[PDB]
Design a protein around this motif. Structure first.
Motif, mmCIF file in Angstrom:
data_model
loop_
_atom_site.group_PDB
_atom_site.id
_atom_site.type_symbol
_atom_site.label_atom_id
_atom_site.label_comp_id
_atom_site.label_asym_id
_atom_site.label_seq_id
_atom_site.Cartn_x
_atom_site.Cartn_y
_atom_site.Cartn_z
ATOM 1 N N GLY A 272 54.774 25.625 -61.173
ATOM 2 C CA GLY A 272 56.354 26.278 -61.772
ATOM 3 C C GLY A 272 57.221 27.066 -60.699
ATOM 4 O O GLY A 272 57.585 27.590 -61.157
ATOM 5 N N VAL A 273 56.867 27.004 -59.142
ATOM 6 C CA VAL A 273 57.525 27.280 -58.088
ATOM 7 C C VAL A 273 58.479 26.806 -57.648
ATOM 8 O O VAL A 273 59.719 26.749 -57.749
ATOM 9 C CB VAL A 273 57.305 28.185 -56.899
ATOM 10 C CG1 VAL A 273 57.960 28.925 -56.077
ATOM 11 C CG2 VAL A 273 56.257 29.321 -57.916
ATOM 12 N N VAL A 274 57.882 25.210 -57.149
ATOM 13 C CA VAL A 274 58.796 23.816 -56.698
ATOM 14 C C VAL A 274 59.967 23.097 -57.342
ATOM 15 O O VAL A 274 60.512 22.982 -57.536
ATOM 16 C CB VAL A 274 58.150 23.348 -55.885
ATOM 17 C CG1 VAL A 274 58.383 22.384 -55.123
ATOM 18 C CG2 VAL A 274 56.385 23.956 -55.420
ATOM 19 N N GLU A 275 59.147 23.213 -58.495
ATOM 20 C CA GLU A 275 60.401 22.635 -59.814
ATOM 21 C C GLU A 275 61.901 23.667 -59.846
ATOM 22 O O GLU A 275 62.702 23.493 -60.318
ATOM 23 C CB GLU A 275 59.169 21.832 -61.102
ATOM 24 C CG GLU A 275 57.762 21.931 -61.043
ATOM 25 C CD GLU A 275 57.897 20.404 -60.296
ATOM 26 O OE1 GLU A 275 59.025 19.882 -60.924
ATOM 27 O OE2 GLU A 275 56.590 20.526 -59.794
ATOM 28 N N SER A 276 61.389 25.044 -60.292
ATOM 29 C CA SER A 276 61.847 25.603 -60.725
ATOM 30 C C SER A 276 63.021 25.877 -59.481
ATOM 31 O O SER A 276 64.399 25.866 -59.271
ATOM 32 C CB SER A 276 61.626 27.163 -60.383
ATOM 33 O OG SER A 276 62.648 28.038 -60.608
ATOM 34 N N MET A 277 62.994 25.648 -58.015
ATOM 35 C CA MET A 277 63.301 25.577 -56.610
ATOM 36 C C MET A 277 63.969 24.970 -56.285
ATOM 37 O O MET A 277 65.320 24.133 -56.553
ATOM 38 C CB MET A 277 63.083 26.713 -54.997
ATOM 39 C CG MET A 277 62.225 27.496 -55.214
ATOM 40 S SD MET A 277 63.730 29.019 -55.725
ATOM 41 C CE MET A 277 62.515 30.200 -55.620
ATOM 42 N N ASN A 278 63.828 23.323 -56.725
ATOM 43 C CA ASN A 278 64.539 21.871 -57.206
ATOM 44 C C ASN A 278 65.669 21.783 -58.231
ATOM 45 O O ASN A 278 66.655 21.430 -57.443
ATOM 46 C CB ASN A 278 63.435 21.213 -57.309
ATOM 47 C CG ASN A 278 62.161 20.841 -55.364
ATOM 48 O OD1 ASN A 278 62.457 21.537 -55.061
ATOM 49 N ND2 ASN A 278 61.626 19.201 -56.193
ATOM 50 N N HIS A 279 65.538 22.748 -59.178
ATOM 51 C CA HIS A 279 66.573 22.898 -60.572
ATOM 52 C C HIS A 279 67.612 23.330 -60.113
ATOM 53 O O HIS A 279 68.484 22.960 -59.750
ATOM 54 C CB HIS A 279 65.476 23.457 -61.503
ATOM 55 C CG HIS A 279 66.672 23.372 -62.456
ATOM 56 N ND1 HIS A 279 67.408 23.109 -63.564
ATOM 57 C CD2 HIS A 279 66.607 25.292 -63.115
ATOM 58 C CE1 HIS A 279 67.804 23.275 -64.519
ATOM 59 N NE2 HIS A 279 67.695 25.087 -64.176
ATOM 60 N N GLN A 280 66.963 25.147 -59.273
ATOM 61 C CA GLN A 280 67.861 25.503 -59.022
ATOM 62 C C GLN A 280 69.145 25.426 -57.902
ATOM 63 O O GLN A 280 70.268 25.047 -57.745
ATOM 64 C CB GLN A 280 67.656 27.291 -58.359
ATOM 65 C CG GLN A 280 66.804 27.507 -59.780
ATOM 66 C CD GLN A 280 66.512 29.033 -59.085
ATOM 67 O OE1 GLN A 280 66.528 29.532 -58.073
ATOM 68 N NE2 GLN A 280 64.989 29.988 -59.885
ATOM 69 N N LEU A 281 68.157 24.363 -57.138
ATOM 70 C CA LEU A 281 69.160 23.607 -55.588
ATOM 71 C C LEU A 281 70.007 22.196 -55.989
ATOM 72 O O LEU A 281 70.690 22.107 -55.918
ATOM 73 C CB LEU A 281 68.298 23.474 -54.505
ATOM 74 C CG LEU A 281 68.692 22.302 -53.340
ATOM 75 C CD1 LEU A 281 69.062 23.064 -52.864
ATOM 76 C CD2 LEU A 281 67.433 21.534 -52.926
ATOM 77 N N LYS A 282 69.595 21.832 -57.009
ATOM 78 C CA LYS A 282 70.645 20.243 -58.066
ATOM 79 C C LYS A 282 71.899 21.418 -58.697
ATOM 80 O O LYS A 282 72.293 20.848 -58.563
ATOM 81 C CB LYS A 282 69.603 19.518 -59.134
ATOM 82 C CG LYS A 282 68.593 18.904 -58.317
ATOM 83 C CD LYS A 282 67.539 18.554 -59.207
ATOM 84 C CE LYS A 282 66.969 17.595 -58.115
ATOM 85 N NZ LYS A 282 65.677 16.657 -59.994
ATOM 86 N N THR A 283 71.768 22.402 -59.216
ATOM 87 C CA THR A 283 72.573 22.997 -60.116
ATOM 88 C C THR A 283 74.183 23.713 -58.885
ATOM 89 O O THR A 283 75.114 24.065 -59.009
ATOM 90 C CB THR A 283 72.157 24.810 -60.944
ATOM 91 O OG1 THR A 283 71.333 25.060 -59.917
ATOM 92 C CG2 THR A 283 71.115 23.377 -62.407
ATOM 93 N N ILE A 284 73.151 24.624 -57.652
ATOM 94 C CA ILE A 284 74.311 24.529 -56.887
ATOM 95 C C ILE A 284 74.783 23.062 -56.068
ATOM 96 O O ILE A 284 75.899 23.438 -55.588
ATOM 97 C CB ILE A 284 73.816 25.095 -55.640
ATOM 98 C CG1 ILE A 284 72.746 26.862 -56.275
ATOM 99 C CG2 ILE A 284 74.452 25.747 -54.571
ATOM 100 C CD1 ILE A 284 72.819 27.993 -55.218
#
Ligand SMILES: [Zn+2]
Ligand SMILES: [Zn+2]
Ligand SMILES: [Zn+2]
Lengths: 252, 193, 207, 47
Positions: free
Chosen positions: B125-137
């Protein structure tokens, strides 16, 4: 002032910052920073809930969960008709702002009573998180079952322990602090958007230095006490108030 | 103090860290209070691996702050994952590692690195969110760099020091520095008292 | 200065090892480059600037340190570059590498184990701290100073509606100064006054 | 109320393209809505 606007545009051109951070860093008003974000081509939900029913000790427990924060509201139903599900949805919509409801293709969720409630309260219903919330609520219910006589008391005690006593996530917050911070940030956004539209219904004729003629109609962005920020020619610039004329605009 | 924590754990079953925070008790007392009930960290790091443009990106996340660390790999073997974990342990204090059921996360080189660096390796729930945010950047600033690895490291800089969001209004680097400094002062006071 | 870093390169076993040192704490980061071109030095500097706050950098007059890639990295990451401690840290890292050479096959695992040993297993100094605790304490104290001066204005951006004695209407938006447990200090028309807690309402007032 | 006056003035401006003072005096609507009716027409202009 204008140095702050120039540094904000160059820093957004490098790093693409949000408008709250740019307003707090470069000491510019929020409408100017929101315009800087809104002019960028690469830079262009807090009211969604999910519902489910479950079984425990021969009872029916209906659970609603706020998705972005993990906030639980639960109840025990005497049956599983559409009228009791419609009453639960009406109580939920009367207490929290509900705009988008996500459920599965059950019988009681596909009903005329639930459809009438969604028509009156203006909710968008969509048929296909709650499984994890049912598992977590059942573990707390079994953890505190010997302190209650009936199942309804144990259900509401588990909802209280889930919402206010368990901490996790990034900063160590509970679910109630997260839902309140999310809805408050959305409220700040909508109030600023109302101010932005009301300001942007004007128009500005400005006169540059060493000239007597008025330039083209630039749109007003911010009107301060001594200065005026305008958008003209895809450029934001600051003119003093003695070289400006602000008139109403009718260009709908 | 201790009786108040016993009343709170009797009613609501708080864990030992929350009782030690909210009631200011030494952690061995809170551990004993939690261990006495029959009904029942600033160094937890999660890791993951994902794919982008045919390349392999490996992402580690510090959980109490959201602090990211990413690397580009030419292969998904165990030796490069062990090198990533060894450099992370040589840079930051790593104590409790969390991963998934992968092919590289169960390997002899990774086991040797965890044994040498004294890391407790746990699996999910945290690592998937951080991977999603990094891909958007990454998709936001992709056209400023030629190679993919320059865009990855620029996304890591923008995520760590240019995104001041959330509840408190702090970025990830200031958060992890303040968290480990406050934990170090608490351990010093618990050793001195 | 709490954000000054120094960089250098050195040779060991026919390789090129690049070493960056935080000066005010003695904090060491190091890597093994395949060559000495400007692209690898700029990539090392980009990873270092993405991990730690770098503001002021000191180097020598090298052939890869004076390069267009390193200048582009410093322009994008807003670093102040100056050309002319690192030799002493190279000496220490070489001695630690010769100490634990026989536990690793390749040079790279020996380099990373020597970095971990020097950062977290060599305690000395005045207080008895290693390098990592020194660098964490330094950056934490500097951040606390600058954020203090911003946080006071942040807390004074709230608005308070209060009630005085024997009047049943809520008085206008004074500014908050300090919120206590039983009292609230407000500034109202350039007058500092103290109101009880049960006679106040503190809003942010988006409007 | 002047709400039927708003609808009738919209039909009348769709035919004859009145100005805003004429509609505000004939249909007894306030001046802001009459200026908005003239503003939404692409062919006319409030003056
Ligand atoms: Zn942008
Ligand atoms: Zn317990
Ligand atoms: Zn017309």
């Amino acid at each position: 002032f204008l140095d702050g606007i120039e540094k904000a545009q160059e820093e957004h051109e490098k790093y693409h910052n949000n408008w709250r951070a740019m307003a707090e860093d470069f000491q510019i008003p929020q409408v100017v920073a929101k315009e800087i974000v809104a002019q960028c081509p690469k830079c262009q939900s807090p009211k969604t809930w999910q519902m489910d029913c479950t079984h425990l000790e021969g009872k029916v427990i209906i659970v609603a969960v706020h998705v972005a924060s993990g906030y639980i509201e639960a109840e025990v139903l005497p049956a599983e008709t559409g009228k009791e599900t419609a009453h639960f949805l009406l109580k939920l919509a009367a207490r929290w702002p509900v705009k988008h409801l996500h459920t599965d293709n059950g019988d009681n969720f596909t009903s005329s009573a639930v459809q009438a409630v969604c028509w009156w309260a203006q909710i968008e219903h969509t048929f296909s998180v709650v499984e994890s919330m049912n598992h977590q609520l059942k573990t707390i219910i079994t953890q505190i079952r010997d302190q209650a006589e009936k199942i309804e008391t144990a259900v509401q005690m588990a909802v209280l322990i889930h919402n206010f006593k368990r901490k996790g996530g990034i900063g160590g917050y509970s679910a109630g602090e997260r839902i309140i911070d999310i809805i408050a940030s959305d409220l700040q956004t909508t109030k600023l958007q109302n101010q932005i539209s009301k300001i942007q219904n004007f128009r500005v004729y400005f006169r540059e230095g060493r000239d007597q003629q008025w330039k083209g109609p630039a749109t007003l962005i911010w009107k301060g006490e001594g200065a005026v920020v305008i958008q003209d020619g895809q450029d934001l610039k600051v003119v003093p108030r003695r070289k400006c004329k602000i008139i109403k605009d009718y260009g709908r």
